[PDB]
Design a protein around this ligand. Structure first.
Ligand code: NI
Length: 341
């Protein structure tokens, strides 16, 4: 049955709630982004209205075959009316097409649902600046002070410099990047751009990327693996066995692999700077784990919430254990006492 933290009070609405069958009292189903833990349950047999971004709607139609008459895309940063309730979609700084949703309830309550997000000070100048928010449905993925990670820009600098050095030293090295969902496209696009190459990938992944409105995409990606020296593979194949096998398939065009696994957080962050990251190596294969996150760090999350000053916080992540829930509630109280709201 649908959990309370996926239901928006005073409305007929649910958020990211497609795996529970027909939810009692639900007149419109919102989808924040196209990640499987959020879309789980949608298919061509769904016949209720789905409200989402343009990009998420492309993916619903093309990848899951949802029929067009039930997809309701909304423009961002624009006041819209849904079943008699004013809503606004905001950029979540997550993966392509990911949104936060502002609901203006008929009784005067304003609710922000962040979906999955990476808080940024640029959000402090969107339509959020213009009114008070009473209730916040918050992505608490990394809500503990041990979770620090560098900016996305530092991590991409590291990747570009590492790849450019390796290929200039050995023009017969292949770069491989792991993927299992949309998001983190900058990793493989930035590397291909510095090397003067397209990114090669499976037909299924190319289709997925063609749904994303990324400018000049036909210029950066391809299904012709032979012409590319940056290859995308499933995240599960980014290990010594999987990579040795791939290299066999390239027919002696290459004699070395440099591979990237963009993880979120790994405890190497508590001790080590990005500058100091080193690979695991076996023979002619090296594997770098890079801390490229599309979720808030602890400090980013804290700054957002202390700026917004909500009256009530509803966590949406790590809510299944009493120890996690108690930990989060203690941080929310600290934040409120330190800031004075
Ligand atoms: Ni997500």
């Amino acid at each position: 049955t649908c959990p309370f933290y996926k239901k928006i009070p005073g409305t007929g609405f649910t958020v990211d709630a497609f795996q529970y069958g027909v939810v009692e009292g639900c007149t419109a189903y919102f989808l924040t982004h196209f990640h499987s833990d959020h879309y789980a349950g949608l298919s061509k047999h769904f016949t209720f209205p789905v409200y989402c971004s343009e990009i998420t709607g492309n993916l619903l139609k093309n990848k899951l075959h949802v029929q067009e008459q039930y997809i309701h895309p909304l423009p961002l940063d624009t006041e819209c009316i849904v079943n008699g309730v004013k809503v606004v979609l905001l950029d979540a700084n997550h993966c392509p097409g990911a949104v936060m949703i502002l609901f203006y309830l008929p009784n005067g309550t304003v609710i922000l649902h962040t979906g999955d997000f990476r808080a940024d000070p640029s959000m402090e100048r969107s339509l959020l600046a213009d009114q008070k928010v009473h209730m916040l449905y918050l992505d608490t993925t990394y809500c503990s002070p041990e979770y620090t990670f560098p900016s996305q820009q530092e991590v991409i600098r590291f990747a570009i410099n590492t790849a450019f050095e390796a290929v200039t030293l050995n023009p017969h090295a292949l770069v491989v990047c792991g993927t299992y969902s949309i998001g983190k496209e900058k990793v493989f696009l930035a590397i291909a751009d510095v090397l003067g190459s397209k990114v090669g990938m499976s037909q299924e992944k190319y289709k997925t990327l063609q749904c994303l409105n990324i400018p000049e995409i036909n210029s950066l990606i391809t299904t012709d693996m032979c012409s590319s020296l940056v290859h995308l593979l499933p995240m599960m194949q980014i290990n010594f066995k999987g990579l040795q096998s791939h290299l066999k398939k390239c027919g002696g065009k290459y004699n070395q692999i440099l591979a990237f696994r963009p993880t979120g957080w790994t405890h190497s962050n508590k001790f080590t700077r990005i500058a100091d990251v080193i690979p695991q190596t076996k023979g002619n294969i090296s594997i770098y784990g890079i801390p490229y996150s599309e979720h808030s760090s602890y400090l980013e999350m804290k700054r957002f919430v202390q700026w917004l000053k909500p009256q009530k916080i509803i966590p949406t992540v790590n809510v299944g254990t009493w120890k996690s829930r108690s930990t989060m509630e203690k941080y929310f109280r600290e934040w409120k006492l330190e800031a004075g709201y």
